[PDB]
Every structure is written in C-alpha cells, then in structure tokens.
mmCIF file of C-alpha atoms and ligand atoms in Angstrom:
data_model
loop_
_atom_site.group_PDB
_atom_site.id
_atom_site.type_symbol
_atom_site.label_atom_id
_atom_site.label_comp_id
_atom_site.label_asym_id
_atom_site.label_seq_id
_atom_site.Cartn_x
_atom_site.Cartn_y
_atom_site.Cartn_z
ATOM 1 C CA UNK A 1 6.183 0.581 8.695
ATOM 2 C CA UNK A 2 3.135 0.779 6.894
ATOM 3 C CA UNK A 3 0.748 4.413 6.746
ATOM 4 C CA UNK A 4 -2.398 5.296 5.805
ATOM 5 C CA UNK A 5 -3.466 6.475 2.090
ATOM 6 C CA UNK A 6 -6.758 6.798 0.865
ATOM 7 C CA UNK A 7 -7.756 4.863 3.293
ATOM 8 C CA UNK A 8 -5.681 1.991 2.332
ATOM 9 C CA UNK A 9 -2.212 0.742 3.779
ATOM 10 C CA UNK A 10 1.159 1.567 2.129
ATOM 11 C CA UNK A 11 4.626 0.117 2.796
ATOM 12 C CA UNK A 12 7.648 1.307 0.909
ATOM 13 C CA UNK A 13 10.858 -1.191 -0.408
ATOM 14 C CA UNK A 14 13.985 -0.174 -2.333
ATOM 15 C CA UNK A 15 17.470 -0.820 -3.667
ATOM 16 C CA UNK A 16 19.733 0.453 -6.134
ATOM 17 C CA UNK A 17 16.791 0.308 -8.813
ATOM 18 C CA UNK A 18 14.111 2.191 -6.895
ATOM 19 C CA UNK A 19 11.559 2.934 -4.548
ATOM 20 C CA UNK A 20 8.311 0.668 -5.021
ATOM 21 C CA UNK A 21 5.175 1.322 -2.882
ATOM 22 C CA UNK A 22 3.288 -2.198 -1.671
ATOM 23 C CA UNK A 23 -0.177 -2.059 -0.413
ATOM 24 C CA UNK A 24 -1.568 -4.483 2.259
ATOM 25 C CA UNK A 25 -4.584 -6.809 1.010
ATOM 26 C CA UNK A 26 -6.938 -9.623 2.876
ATOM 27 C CA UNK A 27 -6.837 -13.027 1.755
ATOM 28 C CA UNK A 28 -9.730 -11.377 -0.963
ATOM 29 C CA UNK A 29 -7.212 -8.985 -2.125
ATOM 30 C CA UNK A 30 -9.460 -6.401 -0.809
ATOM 31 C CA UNK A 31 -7.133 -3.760 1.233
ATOM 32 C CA UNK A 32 -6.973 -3.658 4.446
ATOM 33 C CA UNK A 33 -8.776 -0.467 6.348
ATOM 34 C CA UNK A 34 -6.466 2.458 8.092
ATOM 35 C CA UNK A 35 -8.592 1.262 10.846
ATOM 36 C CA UNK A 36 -6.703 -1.567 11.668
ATOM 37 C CA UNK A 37 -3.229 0.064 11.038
ATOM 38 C CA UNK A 38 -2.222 -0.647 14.314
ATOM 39 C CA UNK A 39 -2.369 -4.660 14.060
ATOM 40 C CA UNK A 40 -0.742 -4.389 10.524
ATOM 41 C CA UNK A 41 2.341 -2.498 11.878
ATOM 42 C CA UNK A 42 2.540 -5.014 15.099
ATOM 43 C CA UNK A 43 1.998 -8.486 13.304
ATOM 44 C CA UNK A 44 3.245 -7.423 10.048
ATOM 45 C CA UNK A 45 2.370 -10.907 7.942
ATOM 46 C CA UNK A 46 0.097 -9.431 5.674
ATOM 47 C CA UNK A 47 -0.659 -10.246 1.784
ATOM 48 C CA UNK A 48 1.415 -7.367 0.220
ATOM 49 C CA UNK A 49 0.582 -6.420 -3.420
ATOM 50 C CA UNK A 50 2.894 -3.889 -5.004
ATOM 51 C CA UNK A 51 1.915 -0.732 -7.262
ATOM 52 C CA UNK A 52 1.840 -1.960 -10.623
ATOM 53 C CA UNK A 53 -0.337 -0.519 -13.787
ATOM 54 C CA UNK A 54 -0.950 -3.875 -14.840
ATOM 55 C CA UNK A 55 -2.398 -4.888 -11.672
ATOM 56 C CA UNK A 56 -5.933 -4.363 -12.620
ATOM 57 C CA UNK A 57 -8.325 -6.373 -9.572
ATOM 58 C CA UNK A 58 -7.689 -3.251 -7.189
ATOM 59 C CA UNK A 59 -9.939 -0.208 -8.262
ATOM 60 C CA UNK A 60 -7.705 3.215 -8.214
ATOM 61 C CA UNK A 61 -4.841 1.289 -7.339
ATOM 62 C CA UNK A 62 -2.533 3.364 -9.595
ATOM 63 C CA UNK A 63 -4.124 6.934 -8.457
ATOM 64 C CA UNK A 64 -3.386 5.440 -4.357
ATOM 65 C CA UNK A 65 -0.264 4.768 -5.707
ATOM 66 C CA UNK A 66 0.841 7.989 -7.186
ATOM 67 C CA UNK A 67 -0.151 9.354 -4.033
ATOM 68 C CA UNK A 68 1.872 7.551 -1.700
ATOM 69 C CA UNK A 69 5.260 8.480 -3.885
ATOM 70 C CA UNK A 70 3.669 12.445 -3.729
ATOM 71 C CA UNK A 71 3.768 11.517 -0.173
ATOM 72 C CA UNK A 72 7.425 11.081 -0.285
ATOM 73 C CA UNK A 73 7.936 14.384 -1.493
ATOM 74 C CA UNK A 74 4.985 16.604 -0.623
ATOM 75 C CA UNK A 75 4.865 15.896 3.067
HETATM 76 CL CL1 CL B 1 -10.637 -12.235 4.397
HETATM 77 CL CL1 CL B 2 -6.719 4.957 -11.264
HETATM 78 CL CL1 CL B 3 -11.912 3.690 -10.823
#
C-alpha cells in the first residue's frame, strides 16, 4: 500500500493519535524511485522512514510530506 509522490514512495499508518506518512528508503536512506513501485508493494520489506521535521538527511522531506497528507484530502 505504498503510492507515488514526488517521485518518492509513501505509505500511511494510524491509530487513535493520528495519521503519519512513512516513506520507503534503500539501505543509503536514499528513497526508493516510483519506478520500482511495483516490487515495493509485492515484497513490502523495505527501510521505512517516517515524516518527521527533525529528520534532516532526506532533502524536501517535509514539503513530500505535506503533500502526501494534501493527498488525503485533495484527491
Ligand atoms: Cl543500496
Ligand atoms: Cl522542505
Ligand atoms: Cl531543499
């Protein structure tokens, strides 16, 4: 369950706290093209790093971010 955003790979999670986006990363922590979003979604044990501001070794993590919650809403 994992789509495509900026060209990077989103997964969603929640609870009774919230909704938290996760993005899928190599063993570099560099993310993972949309062009292998069909291996992702089939063997699903990838390095998942969720949307944080104070995760800072991702560049425009927090702007991907914001747009996969818009996502959620402006569909
Ligand atoms: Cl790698
Ligand atoms: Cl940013
Ligand atoms: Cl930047």
């Amino acid at each position: 369950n994992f789509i495509c955003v900026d060209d990077r790979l989103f997964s969603y999670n929640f609870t009774t706290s919230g909704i938290k986006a996760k993005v899928a990363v190599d063993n570099k922590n560099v993310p993972i093209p949309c062009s292998k979003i069909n291996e992702v979604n089939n063997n699903k044990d990838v390095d998942t790093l969720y949307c944080d501001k104070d995760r800072d070794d991702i560049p425009g993590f927090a702007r991907s971010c914001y747009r996969a919650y818009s996502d959620l809403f402006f569909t």
